[PDB]
Structure 1
Amino acid sequence: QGSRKRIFENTKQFIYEVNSITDPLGQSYKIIVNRWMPTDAVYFFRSADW
């Protein structure tokens, strides 16, 4: 809970804390869950490369 690398955020009208795991190298990874996933794997991507 302390290793969070606070980088930035801008919503300006709600204190909405998003669940996002961090990386030691200085990366911010969002987390998404979908029932249509195969349940036997975990995927990473960029949301624009696909």
Structure 2
Amino acid sequence: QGSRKRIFENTKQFIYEVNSITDPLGQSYKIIVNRWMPTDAVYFFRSADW
């Protein structure tokens, strides 16, 4: 908790916080879930190099 880099999303009508997690280095990570994952592995990427 004490090392949780909060990150929000302003929309002019609501401030939607994001389910993000950060490492000791400060690198923030957003967490999204997909129903078609193989269920026996996790993926880390930027969604732009692909």
- The TM-score normalised by the length of structure 1 is 0.78
Deviation, structure 1 residue 8: 7.4
RMSD of the alignment, in Å? 1.9
Identity rate, percent: 100
Q: Which 5+ residue runs of structure 2 have no aligned equivalent? A: none
Change (3 A) 1:8 1:27: farther
Deviation, structure 1 residue 6: 4.7
2:8/2:15 contact within 8 Å kept: no
Between the aligned partners of 1:20 and 1:39, the Cα distance in structure 2 is 20
Between the aligned partners of 1:9 and 1:22, the Cα distance in structure 2 is 17
Q: Which 5+ residue runs of structure 1 have no aligned equivalent? A: none
2:9/2:17 contact within 8 Å kept: no
- The TM-score normalised by the length of structure 2 is 0.78
User: Matched residue pairs, number?
Assistant: 50
